[PDB]
Amino acid sequence: REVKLLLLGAGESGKSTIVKQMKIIHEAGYSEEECKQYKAVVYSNTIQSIIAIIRAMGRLKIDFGDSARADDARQLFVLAMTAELAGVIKRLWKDSGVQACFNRSREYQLNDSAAYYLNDLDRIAQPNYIPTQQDVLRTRVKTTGIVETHFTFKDLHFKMFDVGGQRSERKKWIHCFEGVTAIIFCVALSDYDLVLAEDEEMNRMHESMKLFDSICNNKWFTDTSIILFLNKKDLFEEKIKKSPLTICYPEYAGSNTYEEAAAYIQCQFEDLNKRKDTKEIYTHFTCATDTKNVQFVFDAVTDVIIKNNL
Amino acid sequence: VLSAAEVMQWSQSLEKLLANQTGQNVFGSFLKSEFSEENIEFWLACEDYKKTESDLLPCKAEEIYKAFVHSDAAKQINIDFRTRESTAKKIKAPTPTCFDEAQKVIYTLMEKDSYPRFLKSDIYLNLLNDLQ
Numbered sequence A: 001r002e003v004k005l006l007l008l009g010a011g012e013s014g015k016s017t018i019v020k021q022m023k024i025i026h027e028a029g030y031s032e033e034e035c036k037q038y039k040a041v042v043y044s045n046t047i048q049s050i051i052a053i054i055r056a057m058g059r060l061k062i063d064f065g066d067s068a069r070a071d072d073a074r075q076l077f078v079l080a081m082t083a084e085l086a087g088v089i090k091r092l093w094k095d096s097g098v099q100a101c102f103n104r105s106r107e108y109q110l111n112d113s114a115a116y117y118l119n120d121l122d123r124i125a126q127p128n129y130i131p132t133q134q135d136v137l138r139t140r141v142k143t144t145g146i147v148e149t150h151f152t153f154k155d156l157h158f159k160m161f162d163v164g165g166q167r168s169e170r171k172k173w174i175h176c177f178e179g180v181t182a183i184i185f186c187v188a189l190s191d192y193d194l195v196l197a198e199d200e201e202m203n204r205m206h207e208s209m210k211l212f213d214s215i216c217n218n219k220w221f222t223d224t225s226i227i228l229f230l231n232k233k234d235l236f237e238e239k240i241k242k243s244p245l246t247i248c249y250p251e252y253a254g255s256n257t258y259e260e261a262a263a264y265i266q267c268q269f270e271d272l273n274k275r276k277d278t279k280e281i282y283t284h285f286t287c288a289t290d291t292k293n294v295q296f297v298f299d300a301v302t303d304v305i306i307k308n309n310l
Numbered sequence B: 001v002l003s004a005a006e007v008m009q010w011s012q013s014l015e016k017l018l019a020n021q022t023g024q025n026v027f028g029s030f031l032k033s034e035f036s037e038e039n040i041e042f043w044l045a046c047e048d049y050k051k052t053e054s055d056l057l058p059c060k061a062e063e064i065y066k067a068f069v070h071s072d073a074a075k076q077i078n079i080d081f082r083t084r085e086s087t088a089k090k091i092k093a094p095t096p097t098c099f100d101e102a103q104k105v106i107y108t109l110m111e112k113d114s115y116p117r118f119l120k121s122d123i124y125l126n127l128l129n130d131l132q
């Protein structure tokens, strides 16, 4: 009773985070010692994040609110967790101009967990800091290649394959493509106003759509349950207030509200299905870093797989 | 011959693992099983490129660019647009440090993703445990 499961989607859509949730829900949690191994990652994320904002400022020619921050920025580069570095990061982060550049993060490349970490620097910068489970889920590590994980759920033995990401990794996907029972295709909802890290000219959501069109309609997956995770819905909810969906969909005639714009995105992906007669896309709006939400959604997905291979 | 202590020191750092040709091979094998060997093959191509002679660098640079860096490379390394563009500009009149930028990003990618997993894999553990 094996289930071959593919976690697919464009770079940074949340595939590795769902894999982490699978370890938490099905293989019982992250221990204190495992969490402590993620300290360095959290620091690396926080540090590379504030550096990215500061470098953007140079290129976008944004001034600091207060010019004393210039010396903090220089110190940041030389330093890059000490109490000194912490204080450098806190002061930069609270500065009006760094904030200005932060709100313009769509013009460069910034980790989505930047704020989460940078707003909790007091907690993170303590000497005896132990990452919480959520801190681990929020970490960023670029996946390259194909990684196989095993776990058992509802008496089904999942062989789960997690992949990269970027255009460069996608040529390698064919080596997973045989005998697939289910695909969870992840899309970053909040990517609608961003650009590919590997191609500054291509809107990330347009990429995700073209990639889903290719996967959904692939003849290898005619007998495969195609599940669509419209992920990062929490980030999307915050963003759609600030940044209009028309940046991605110029024809979009509706309101910039969470529920209408979410529905429109759903329908844009669901229309790519060119076998609506024989094949159903199983769509869920997810927050991959929310364990509770991934547990509920994965339970539904597993029931869809039972019903489809029964 | 290859030691036990030696293999344990591979858990200290990626630099120590890639310091010697044995460790390169073993880690290489691991990357092959994860379909990411192009990263190490690229890193090794940059290392040879650095020792390569002033005279032949234009060809060596073009070769490596085509094989690993370009959009359509068969062993295309996972790097961003800005890094790929600045490498592209350097291929025309290439110096010995031409690929340093891309090399660093592929080292960091191997170091942060592939390497922590290597240390927990059968390949490494079976090697380590069979020598004791």
Ligand SMILES: Nc1nc2c(ncn2[C@@H]2O[C@H](COP(=O)(O)OP(=O)(O)O)[C@@H](O)[C@H]2O)c(=O)[nH]1
Binding pocket: A009, A010, A011, A012, A013, A014, A015, A016, A017, A018, A112, A113, A137, A138, A139, A140, A141, A142, A143, A165, A186, A231, A232, A233, A234, A235, A286, A287, A288, A289
């Ligand atoms: N807030 C939020 N963050 C997310 C969500 N999904 C992923 N992330 C974060 O986004 C980053 C990229 O996620 P990752 O799983 O590595 O993307 P991958 O390239 O598809 O594997 C990580 O730091 C995650 O913690 C989400 O639904 N909400």
Ligand code: ALF
Binding pocket: A009, A010, A011, A012, A013, A015, A016, A141, A142, A143, A144, A163, A164, A165, A166
């Ligand atoms: F950007 Al990714 F896994 F797809 F690290």
Ligand SMILES: [Mg+2]
Binding pocket: A014, A015, A016, A017, A141, A142, A143, A163, A164, A165
């Ligand atoms: Mg990943």
